[PDB]
Design a binder for these strands. Structure first.
Lengths: 164, 97, 232
RNA sequence: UUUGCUACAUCGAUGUCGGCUCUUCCCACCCUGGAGGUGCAGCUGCCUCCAAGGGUAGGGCUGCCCGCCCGUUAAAGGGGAGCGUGAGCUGGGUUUAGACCGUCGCGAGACAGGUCGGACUCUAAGGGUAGGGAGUGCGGACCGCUUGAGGGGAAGGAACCCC
RNA sequence: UGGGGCGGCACUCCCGCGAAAAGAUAACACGGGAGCCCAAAGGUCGGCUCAGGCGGUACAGAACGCCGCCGUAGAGCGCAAG
RNA sequence: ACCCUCUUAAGGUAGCCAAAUGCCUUGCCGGGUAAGUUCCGGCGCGCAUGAAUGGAUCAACGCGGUCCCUACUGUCCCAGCCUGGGGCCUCGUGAACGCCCUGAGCCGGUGCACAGUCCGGCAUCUCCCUACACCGAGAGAAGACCCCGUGGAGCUUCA
RNA sequence: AAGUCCCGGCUAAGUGCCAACGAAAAGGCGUCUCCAGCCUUAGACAGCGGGAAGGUGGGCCCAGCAGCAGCCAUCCUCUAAG
């Protein structure tokens, strides 16, 4: 389903697992890559500039592409540390009954319209929240800006890159 | 769905007790005063004393003492434009001002 | 080589692979596409929705399951074609939709086939019906190589080497990119083929089954190869 | 341009599928015209950009629409107009009353399942359109010859053959 | 009653949330319950301290009884939730 | 093919079939056509065939349903010419329906969401005759469809 | 009806001449502006002629890759030059 459906806030935070049966497993499983505790010079970060939600599909695709680019440059355990910070706590739900139960003269239309869970997302409730960062030495500062630019292309919210 | 209208409905947090007020009645010095007719009191429900306990709608209101029946007091309170008389045990009262 | 086999119905699918002359089933699953009678809506307009919607939901998982079992084989470049069969229009709806990956969809060999049965007996029926296609699909590099060899011979550019004595000279230098060996058990040709594989030279073994094999045997004695670079 | 969601308009009625007939429009370009790239030698291909002036046909099967197929073609593109058009036709489909079958129901009966039979009203106040006659104005009554603001056009399009 | 039908019961009653820190507040909104059980599981008076862990003891074992140390409740209070 | 058990007594025999009965479904193979979702033959995973609730079966008969061939043709390619009666022009007789109004050219909008009348434009000299029916959400009938009413009527039965 | 009103700037598309009413991610040093950091008369950037390199084209593997085909180090005849 198009991402414009689940990019905006519609309702409260829906996270309590004990009152929500049958939540699908998120696509993201590994949130920290590389060699943390390595000796690094630069600590550049990816910062959002709007409020919204990021589906767990967008969050996993932005991670595979960034890891492949950095691993393509020199190596994997070598001097880079890739970390994605936000976890998908919010649960997004769809009134799927328009598919099946909306055509049996079953509770069709908007009758009994509370939806069923379809996946998870990361609410971004503040302006300027950290989403990813990567740590490299001084010789790799350029291959690290490009990794974050390619990853920023697969995310719904407008972002920046900051160097420190 | 419409809400159940029990006696203690929608009181999950009004009838809380803070961590430093728990236990069987702590303050005895308030109970050593005998309210006379014409005094002003505040209806403050004590969640741990379950006898002579008023309704949620009167918590924090200011009443006037008009009499006594046994160990409990007759308190006249205003809700809107209506006068209402309650019989409250003194563990659910504090003096006003 | 590996050939993909798919049989799809309105509510049943079978996935298999053809490894040489062996047929192996990968997954058989049902879909629960109901009819008009266990319904339901008791309305003509919206009863036809379900029958045409979990029909599509079933086709979605057929495509998804095909992707999981066939994409690994493609990444090692081991599949050479995909044959799809089945009764009705189920095969047409699956092939012409977006439910197959473009890598898989590009390997589907036309045309689609009518198969009445499912399971392993159905898979063997699909192979029997497509024996004509697999005849053309089994020798392509050999047919391409002979045309390329014929082009180089006329140009007289020395890119093609022939003769048992001269081939052994080029084999030691690793200059023969591909060596076509006529099938002759117990002769020097078979022994030469076994040695040739040690130098990285791809070897194609052909016999009388190909009309071009007679041309190779009559002219070059059955031994002819293509050179990676000019030698003399 | 589908299918849903909503229930704003029409219940003292806006005739409800398909086809035929006739007109016009969109462009997201199938062919015809221009330019470029190519893993473009030539022939044939594939792709990108401009462009709606002209074209896009005949049949078998089904009530169809979609679709499959036959012989050709430069190509036999895709959509809108109250799913354009029943005071133009048709009446195969569909939704009355009659009847048969299967399943269901104690029954009367039901199906969204199949099948046979089943009505198509009207003399055009107004506008529009296609043509044909008089009047007043310019400009006192008449005969004759003209110009060329303006308006419309596709008046032509395409293919095959020779060198 | 997001047409009616089929379904469900949001048709009597109770808890949380919806509910926007007084009061009132809707949805075929979400998460659930009651239609009883007890002569004690009721009344009063007295004594005691619970779950869990640590050290020492034959059978003895994570979990029998005994001797000590800690333990704000992490137990129990008929049944949903507070 | 044989034996044991449960619903509830038994467990579809002879035959027939994708049937006027088969959902899937244009079932599969063959015939007929250049090309056959219909038709014929065969098969039998028979959703849901079957024995006076009558099964199989067609001699003769049918203003019954369907498919194919020959002959024949204006049904068509693709229309043309001719004839009788009307229409057209004139004399006599002499109605009916539409009608807030006479103020109704059209394009884009506004507005309960498709205006003759409102807004912005572009147009527009007056009258008469024949022909056409596209628009006036054209005329004709307190919608038969659908829902509601603590409205009916006829039928049924285990109300 | 009332300003072809005044000052500082921008836009070349008829963009625009829209309170409620009609456009996103991406690309543009097209042009206009503000912050960083780094080189500049001890001659910057761009350009132009030359030196534009030598033991050695060292090499392992190789008929040969004589940087750049499969792993890789790393030494001065030197000074206005590598």
């Amino acid at each position: 389903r198009p991402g414009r459906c689940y990019r905006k806030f519609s309702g409260p935070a829906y996270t309590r697992r004990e009152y929500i049966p049958g939540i699908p497993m998120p696509k993201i499983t590994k949130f920290v890559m590389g060699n943390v505790n390595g000796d690094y010079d630069y600590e550049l970060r990816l910062i959002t500039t709007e409020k919204g939600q990021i589906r767990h599909n967008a969050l996993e695709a932005a991670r595979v592409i960034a890891l492949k680019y950095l691993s393509k440059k020199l190596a994997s355990e070598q001097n880079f540390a890739l970390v994605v910070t936000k976890y998908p706590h919010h649960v997004i739900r769809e009134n799927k009954m328009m598919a099946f139960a909306g055509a049996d003269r079953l509770q069709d239309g908007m009758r009994l319209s509370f939806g069923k869970p379809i996946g998870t997302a990361a609410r971004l409730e503040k302006l300027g929240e950290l989403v990813m960062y990567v740590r490299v030495k001084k010789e790799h500062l350029e291959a690290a800006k490009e990794a974050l630019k390619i990853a920023s292309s697969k995310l719904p919210i407008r972002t920046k890159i900051e160097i420190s | 769905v419409a809400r159940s209208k029990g006696y203690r409905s929608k009181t999950r947090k009004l009838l809380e007790k803070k961590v430093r007020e728990k236990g069987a009645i702590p303050k005895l010095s308030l109970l050593m005063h005998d309210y006379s007719q014409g005094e002003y009191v505040v209806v403050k429900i004590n969640p741990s004393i379950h006898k002579g306990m008023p309704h949620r709608r009167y918590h924090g209101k200011v009443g006037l003492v008009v009499g006594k029946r046994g160990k409990a007091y007759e308190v006249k309170v205003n809700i809107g434009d209506k006068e209402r008389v309650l019989i409250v045990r003194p563990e659910h009262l504090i003096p006003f001002n | 080589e590996v050939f993909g086999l798919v049989i799809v119905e309105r509510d049943y699918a079978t996935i298999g692979v053809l490894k040489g002359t062996k047929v192996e089933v990968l997954d058989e699953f049902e879909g629960f596409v109901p009819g008009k009678h266990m319904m339901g809506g008791q309305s003509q307009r919206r009863i036809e929705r379900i029958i045409e919607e979990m029909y599509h939901n079933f086709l979605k998982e057929v495509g998804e399951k095909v992707n999981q079992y066939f994409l690994p084989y493609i990444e090692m470049k081991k599949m050479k074609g995909i044959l799809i069969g089945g009764p009705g229009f189920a095969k047409k709806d699956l092939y012409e939709s977006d439910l197959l990956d473009y890598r898989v969809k590009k390997l589907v060999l036309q045309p689609l086939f009518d198969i009445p049965d499912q399971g392993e007996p159905g898979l063997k029926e699909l192979i029997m019906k497509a024996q004509d296609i697999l005849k053309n699909q089994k020798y392509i590099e050999v047919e391409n190589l002979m045309e390329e060899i014929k082009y180089h011979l006329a140009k007289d550019d020395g890119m093609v080497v022939y003769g048992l004595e001269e081939i052994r000279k080029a084999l030691q230098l690793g200059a023969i990119d591909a060596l076509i060996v006529y099938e002759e058990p117990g002769s020097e040709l078979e022994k030469l083929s076994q040695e040739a594989e040690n130098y990285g030279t791809k070897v194609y073994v052909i016999g009388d089954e190909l009309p071009d094999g007679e041309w190779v045997k009559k002219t070059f004695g059955g031994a002819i190869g293509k050179l990676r670079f000019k030698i003399y």
